[PDB]
Structure formats: C-alpha cells, structure tokens
C-alpha cells in the first residue's frame, strides 16, 4: 500500500502513527503558488489560508481504526480536490495542510 | 534543523 510506504519512508510513521495524511502530486511551485490564491479562514479560525483555484491530485491516508503502533495500517484514497494550506513567513509559503475542498 | 515550511515538503509534497 502506498500509504504505508510513502509514510514509512517520509518518516512520518516511523516512531508513531500519524491517523491522517494528504500527499499533494503537484509540483512544489503549484503548491506554493496557492499562497496567493483564494484567501479565506481555516478551521482554526486565522484568515490566512488560501484555497487553491485548481483540483490538486492528491491521495488521503487514512489510520484504519484495526491497527496499532509499530503496525499502522493506512487506507489510500486518490482524489483531485482543491487544497487550502496556511502560508506564513517570507518567501510566503505553505506551512500546514488545512483541507481539500 | 528542520523549518515548519520545510516540514511542510516532506510531509505532503510529492510532485
């Protein structure tokens, strides 16, 4: 499973298992781009999100609830949805995944 | 060592 790798490797479950997981398949200056695109709120409140014009391909790891540390299960789903990332510091770039719309 | 946008790259990016 792609999760299970991506995230191996990543080092993003390689001491814990982290429950969810966007990878975006565009390129990093698309991405960061986004900074500059639609401006709205994000879940936690702080108006400095921006939410991408476009439908990103992207792929949502989920944490099948089954599953426990060292062994994290992770449930693949691919889907194009816009994305909305919190952009701060200079040059302003994305910082935190926020959603996909 | 590792910034928060930096963070950012090698959590979610994949291009």
Redesign the interface.
């Known amino acids: 499973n792609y999760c299970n790798q991506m995230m191996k490797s990543r080092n993003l479950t390689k001491d814990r298992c982290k429950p969810v997981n966007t990878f975006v398949h565009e390129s990093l200056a698309d991405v960061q781009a986004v900074c500059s695109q639609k401006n709205v709120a994000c879940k936690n409140g702080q108006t400095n999100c921006y939410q991408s014009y476009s439908t990103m391909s992207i792929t949502d790891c989920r944490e099948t609830g089954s599953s426990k540390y060292p062994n994290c299960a992770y449930k693949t789903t691919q889907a194009n949805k816009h994305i909305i990332v919190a952009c701060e510091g200079n040059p302003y770039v994305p910082v935190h995944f926020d959603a996909s719309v | 060592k590792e910034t928060?946008?930096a963070?950012?790259?090698?959590?979610?990016?994949?291009?």
Do not use: V
Not at chain 2, 7 to 15: A, L, P, V, W
């Open positions: 928060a946008a963070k950012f790259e090698r959590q979610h990016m994949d291009s």
